[PDB]
């Protein structure tokens, strides 16, 4: 049999089978509800569209996100997403195969229990397991000693591991991610005249973000160059056949990652969190973590993030130490690529939580290995 490896994310859902190199299906995790009357007769009355069809018909829908900052807020919508993924998208009955899910570190306990109950009582899978998102990245990378820097939508976290002994006191968590960058892009695009308010307009701004953005190696010099000349300008086309012309905002959106004071937050940029995590471990292992940094998640695909990260860490860290930022391509799916590998391993095939085990022990079972 093949064991599904679903990765319920904060901004996308990637579902596939074990022993593959890419998710079988990938689609946004949104639920759209109709807003208007409906005048024609004979058309099917849909209470709510889910998945990609909602993204197709965003004009007359009120799109909502069941997940936010990793935590799950709405449960009916999440169950609808899971049903759509299992039946309509993957087209495989869930009873036959086990399943593997991923949850970010330091999340509330209740989340795990509710997930388990919804995956046992309602869907009736024969076995389920849940894993920390950061850890699975190291299987995909191919090493055992490192400091992953998973940065998904919603939240970003750092988890240092050494010789396969995760240090739990050095783990760091932070609520700066792609959604805040999208909101800031809207707020700063307001200056030139372009006003985006509704949710679908936010979806458009998200596409604008994805296509036209980059991270400057140095910020003040880039601002001076953009102000003096007019070479840092790009033209994009809306669905309405209108042309936006973006200038400085190309590198003021991602810059909030390194300067969280733009949004009014107070925490330090991501480089400082990485450095603090490294310096919260023991003295003897700091060199190895320095040597092997790792990035994951979609948000770390901005052109030029690796160079700035290396420069900042090198400036912060002492000399005589060599810093490398392992930033392989296709990092977007890295987390998922871990899970499939973890499923394949023969040893891991003994660590599931069978249904009868949950029936007997109770909800606490999952937390024993937490």
């Amino acid at each position: 049999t093949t064991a599904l490896v679903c990765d319920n994310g904060s901004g996308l859902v990637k579902a596939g089978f074990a022993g593959d190199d890419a998710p079988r299906a990938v689609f946004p995790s949104i639920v759209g509800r109709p807003r208007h009357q409906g005048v024609m007769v004979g058309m099917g009355q849909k209470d709510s569209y889910v998945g990609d069809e909602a993204q197709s018909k965003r004009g007359i829908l009120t799109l909502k996100y069941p997940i936010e900052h990793g935590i799950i807020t709405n449960w009916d919508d999440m169950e609808k997403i899971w049903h759509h993924t299992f039946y309509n998208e993957l087209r495989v009955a869930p009873e036959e195969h086990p399943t593997l899910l991923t949850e970010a570190p330091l999340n509330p306990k209740a989340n795990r229990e509710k997930m388990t109950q919804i995956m046992f009582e309602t869907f009736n899978v024969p076995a389920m397991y849940v894993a920390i998102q950061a850890v699975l990245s190291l299987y995909a990378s191919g090493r055992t000693t490192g400091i992953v820097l998973d940065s998904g939508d919603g939240v970003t976290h750092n988890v240092p591991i050494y010789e396969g002994y995760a240090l739990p006191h050095a783990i760091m968590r932070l609520d700066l991610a792609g959604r805040d960058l999208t909101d800031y892009l809207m707020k700063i695009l307001t200056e030139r005249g372009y006003s985006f308010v509704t949710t679908a307009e936010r979806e458009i701004v998200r596409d604008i973000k994805e296509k036209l953005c980059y991270v400057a190696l140095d910020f003040e010099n880039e601002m001076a160059t953009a102000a003096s000349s007019s070479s840092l300008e790009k033209s994009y086309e809306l669905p309405d056949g209108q042309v936006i012309t973006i200038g400085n905002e190309r590198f003021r959106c991602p810059e909030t990652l390194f300067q969280p004071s733009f949004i009014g937050m107070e925490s330090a940029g991501i480089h400082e969190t990485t450095y603090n995590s490294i310096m919260k471990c023991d003295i003897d292992i700091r060199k190895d973590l320095y040597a092997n940094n790792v990035m994951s998640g979609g948000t770390t695909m901005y052109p030029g993030i690796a160079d700035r990260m290396q420069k900042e860490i090198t400036a912060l860290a002492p000399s005589t130490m060599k810093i490398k930022i392992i930033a392989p391509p296709e990092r977007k799916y890295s987390v998922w690529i871990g899970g499939s590998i973890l499923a394949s391993l023969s040893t891991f095939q003994q660590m599931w939580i069978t249904k009868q085990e949950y029936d007997e022990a109770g909800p606490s079972i999952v937390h024993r290995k937490c």
């Binding site: 022993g19 593959d20 190199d21 890419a22 299987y139 995909a140 191919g142 090493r143 055992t144 690529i337 499939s340 590998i341 394949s344 391993l345 023969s346 040893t347």
Partner: protein, 69 residues
């Protein structure tokens, strides 16, 4: 018929490559280990053999596809 069978050969080649990628990733992970669990010791050999079999199957499939061409 020729076009359809050529397309089927292309699909089979794509699937074989997709399998090779995953097997190579698993072997790349397993190599770094230094004191593997007894089960992993056998699984490494199994994967090493499966990789060879897939590579020869890929060679045969590409040769056939070219021969049709």
């Amino acid at each position: 018929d020729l076009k359809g069978q050529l397309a089927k050969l292309e699909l089979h080649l794509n699937k074989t490559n997709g399998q090779i990628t995953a097997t190579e990733r698993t072997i790349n992970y397993l190599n770094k280990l230094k004191n593997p669990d007894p089960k992993t010791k056998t699984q490494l050999i199994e994967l090493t053999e499966k990789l060879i079999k897939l590579k020869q199957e890929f060679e045969t499939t590409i040769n056939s596809q070219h021969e049709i061409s």
